[PDB]
Design a protein around this ligand. Structure first.
Ligand SMILES: [K+]
Length: 390
């Protein structure tokens, strides 16, 4: 029997590897569970790791190496720029090597193009995307009565920030808010956000939507606190590890929408968090739940694949993913065939002292206040995705 070989292509060493190493932990955790159940095709699944130190260009080289080493599946998630390279190199390879197609399981790259203008049959996204993040965070705040009528959009000036801005603008009419002004700023360089905060203060808004991460999120929220800006921040990345530890009371009351919260589904979500901590050493945070749950859906798909003469057929695997659904610790996970965007619940959360599980050793944690089903969470199919089918 031919074993299934899955290549993890991630930043796996050095000072920039924090997020890649969380993907590694989630991948080894859930592929470990699938191997505990017997693997695939009567053999354990082999996990091949490729440390990419070279960004998009390095990823092209590592994808070539993985395929040459016999991987039939590539997994990655820490960078949309790298994901855009992987998904196109995989698509191009597949077109030129009919019958030998490789799958790309995208476990966390959230740029809209991956299920839109770059969508294709051998890519599957198991994580949120910009539209899911910001439609659900806005709707959750609207439903709770804390959104207000006036909003500001502030994001980083690259593909991700543009996707977030476009989403926030597009949903204003339907959800019921006004985007008073919008700003795109330099990426991961600004130390003093006070001039941007002054503009937001002048706009007299209730809510600030931002897809910012790391310093661009934290230093912006801190400048807002120092200036007495009263608006709530509506974010996608407030729960990066360390953010609450570094912001403390400055983060209290601000909002994030994510696929998981350990308090959001009673014993099921707690038991998962404790099991994950037993295996990996930490509670599953940030990017890890979506990667685990996506690989849970993947494992369910494998269970439903019929083996033919012991050779692995990635087209059969892709069709099985389209058809699969699994109950995760957060509820039902399935896959949309039109664009291969996964359908799954989203939990809108507030930083609060009243959360039972604390973040970063502080008095604060993420308190869940609204859960949307997958049907309520998934974004509309983009007019730009036209997927050629086998
Ligand atoms: K409201």
């Amino acid at each position: 029997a031919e074993p299934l070989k899955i290549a993890l292509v991630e930043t796996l060493s050095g000072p920039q590897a924090s997020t890649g190493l969380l993907y590694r932990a989630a991948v080894l955790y859930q592929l470990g569970k699938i191997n505990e159940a017997g693997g695939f095709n009567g053999e354990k699944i082999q996990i091949l790791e490729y440390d990419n130190q070279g960004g998009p260009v390095g990823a092209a080289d590592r994808v070539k190496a993985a395929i040459a080493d016999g991987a039939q599946i590539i997994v990655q998630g820490s960078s949309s720029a790298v994901a855009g390279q992987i998904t196109e190199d995989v698509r191009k390879y597949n077109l030129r090597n009919k019958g030998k197609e490789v799958l790309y399981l995208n476990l966390g790259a959230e740029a809209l193009e991956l299920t839109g203008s770059k969508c294709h049959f051998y890519h599957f996204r198991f994580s949120p995307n910009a539209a899911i993040r910001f439609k659900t965070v806005a709707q959750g705040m609207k439903d709770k009565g804390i959104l207000g009528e006036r909003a500001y959009s502030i994001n980083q000036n690259y593909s991700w920030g543009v996707d977030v801005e476009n989403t926030v603008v597009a949903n204003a009419k339907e959800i019921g808010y006004e985007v008073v002004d919008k700003t795109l700023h330099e990426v991961n360089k600004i130390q003093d956000f006070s001039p941007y905060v002054a503009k937001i203060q002048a706009a007299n808004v209730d809510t600030v939507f931002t897809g910012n991460w790391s310093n661009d999120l934290l230093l912006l929220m801190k400048a807002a606190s120092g200036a007495g800006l009263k608006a709530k921040f509506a974010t996608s990345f407030l729960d990066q590890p360390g953010n609450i530890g570094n912001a403390g009371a400055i983060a209290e009351g601000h909002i994030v929408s994510t696929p998981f919260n350990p308090e959001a589904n009673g014993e099921a979500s707690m038991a998962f968090a404790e099991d994950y901590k037993k295996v990996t050493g930490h509670y599953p945070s940030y990017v890890e739940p979506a990667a685990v749950f996506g690989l849970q859906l993947f494992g369910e798909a494998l269970k439903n694949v019929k083996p033919g003469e012991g050779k692995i057929n990635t087209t059969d695997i892709a069709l099985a993913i389209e058809n699969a659904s699994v109950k995760t610790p957060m509820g039902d996970y399935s896959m949309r065939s039109d664009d291969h965007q996964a359908k799954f619940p989203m939990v809108v959360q507030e930083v609060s002292k009243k959360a039972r599980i604390k973040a970063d050793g502080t008095e604060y944690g993420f308190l869940p206040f609204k859960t949307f089903t997958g049907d309520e969470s998934i974004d509309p199919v983009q007019e730009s995705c036209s997927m050629k089918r086998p």
